[PDB]
């Protein structure tokens, strides 16, 4: 149900193998066994990156399916993640949660951090697990970035990537941003590369 141009462009595959997204953790859960292809024999698994591309194509379609672009909310507490979600929220107009996500923000309308979304993106479902479980109370889909040993409960359309390195998380946020702006209509030509480089999303500590 997609045109043939939507697939892996080889410069994006060079970009993916440049950011070491295909490297992962050492434990493989029962749920995420099809994302692994095989194991490099030290204990490091390598992941099917075509699945990551087409899975973020799904996540881009979920984000484009919402009518109000301010109703999607990005969640972050990792050190790379705040910069990544503030760039994503700057570029698509989402509402970012940087640093400590406030408890009682998805119920409890009294608090000024009460935002009700219809769609939630999470950097990892272990450190930001509280936004996952508070979104499990008020009926919210959550599309997430899960590793090979992330908790796989309470997520749907989860994107396998590497949350450990700053390269992969900044790139995968950049690719979600460029996929949804190429799908909304802000960049008409599918052939044209996006004008902003992916290193804008990258974290530096001075």
């Amino acid at each position: 149900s997609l045109p043939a141009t939507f697939d892996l462009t080889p410069e994006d595959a060079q970009l993916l193998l440049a950011a070491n997204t295909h490297l992962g953790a050492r434990n493989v859960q029962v749920h995420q066994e099809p994302y692994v292809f095989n194991a490099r024999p030290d204990g490091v698994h390598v992941i099917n990156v075509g699945k990551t591309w087409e899975k973020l194509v799904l996540a881009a379609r979920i984000i484009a399916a919402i009518p109000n672009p301010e109703d999607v909310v990005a969640i972050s507490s990792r050190t790379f993640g705040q910069r990544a979600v503030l760039k994503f929220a700057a570029h698509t107009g989402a509402t970012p949660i940087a640093g400590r996500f406030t408890p009682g923000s998805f119920t409890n309308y009294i608090t000024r951090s009460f935002k009700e979304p219809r769609l939630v993106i999470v950097t990892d479902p272990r450190s930001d697990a509280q936004a996952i479980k508070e979104a499990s109370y008020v009926n919210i889909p959550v599309i997430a970035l899960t590793d090979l040993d992330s908790p796989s409960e309470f997520v749907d359309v989860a994107i396998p990537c590497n949350n450990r390195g700053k390269h992969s998380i900044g790139l995968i946020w950049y690719l979600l941003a460029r996929e949804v702006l190429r799908l909304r209509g802000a960049l008409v030509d599918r052939t044209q590369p996006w004008s902003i480089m992916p290193d804008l999303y990258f974290y530096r500590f001075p």
Binding site: S127, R164, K166
Partner: protein, 272 residues
């Protein structure tokens, strides 16, 4: 009847390790001028080192020279390019900047210095006139005229005498002359240990505090950092071989506060 050992180096930058390990008589037969930073001299606190510094000040051969700020900025840019700025001290950066300024003044230019790591040296301007592999400098029975010709060469105009492996790698990245503190021969290659990611294959130096990095700087793999021996050639300049939790920062701050409280308790026990 000792032979008149002529100095093969016009000026040598001396660190605190070569000043503490060797006397002025050991460095008298190798270098003609002695230059050092004032902060390195102020950092000396040993009694025998203070006696040797008093003997050198009575001799007057040591020159207390502070490095320039522009050379300090160039050295800091080179250390940020090579990634050695996190382990190198400010005194080491000032000593490298003073060595770079002395090499710029002695050779009348920066043609022998590399601005970036891996950059080829500008050899077109040369015709206008412990784990250290020091092999190739032995077996050179040079005469007095040969020693004067070698001291007149621009390669032996400036030398950096130091014991810091990060400073030695920064000088090898800057293609600077490195001399042994006990032997006095020119260093050709240096072998040091570096942290290598087992998956991302990223190269980082050893830690200054000695603490093992639980997470890699680029890979993020738990246990992905491994001790890898790396060799650096002075001619080529090529080195040949989670943490995002706030509780991790709290544990690091608690470890630092525990180290500070232990240092305060040790100072109170010593002074009590």
């Amino acid at each position: 009847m000792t032979e008149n050992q002529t100095a093969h180096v016009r000026a040598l930058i001396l660190d605190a390790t070569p000043l503490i390990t060797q006397s002025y008589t050991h460095y008298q037969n190798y270098a003609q001028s002695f230059y050092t930073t004032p902060t390195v001299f102020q950092e000396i606190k040993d009694a025998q080192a203070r006696k040797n510094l008093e003997i050198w000040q009575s001799l007057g051969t040591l020159k207390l020279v502070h490095p320039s700020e522009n050379s300090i900025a160039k050295v800091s840019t080179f250390a940020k390019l090579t990634g050695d700025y996190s382990v190198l001290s400010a005194n080491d950066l000032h000593i490298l900047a003073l060595t770079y300024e002395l090499e710029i003044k002695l050779n009348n230019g920066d043609w022998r210095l590399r601005k970036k790591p891996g950059d080829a040296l500008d050899a077109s301007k040369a015709d206008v006139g412990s784990g250290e592999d020091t092999t190739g400098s032995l077996g050179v029975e040079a005469s007095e005229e040969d020693r004067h010709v070698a001291l007149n060469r621009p390669e032996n105009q400036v030398a950096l005498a130091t014991g810091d492996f990060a400073v030695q790698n920064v000088a090898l990245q800057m293609n600077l002359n490195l001399m042994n503190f006990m032997s006095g021969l020119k260093i050709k290659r240096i072998r040091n240990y570096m942290l290598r990611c087992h998956a991302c294959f990223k190269i980082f130096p050893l830690p200054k505090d000695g603490k093992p990095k639980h997470f890699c700087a680029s890979c993020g793999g738990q246990g992905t950092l491994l001790r890898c021996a790396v060799s650096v050639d002075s001619r080529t300049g090529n080195v040949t071989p989670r943490e995002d939790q706030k509780e991790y920062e709290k544990v690091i701050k608690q470890e630092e506060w525990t180290r500070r409280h232990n240092e305060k308790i040790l100072n109170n026990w010593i002074g009590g």
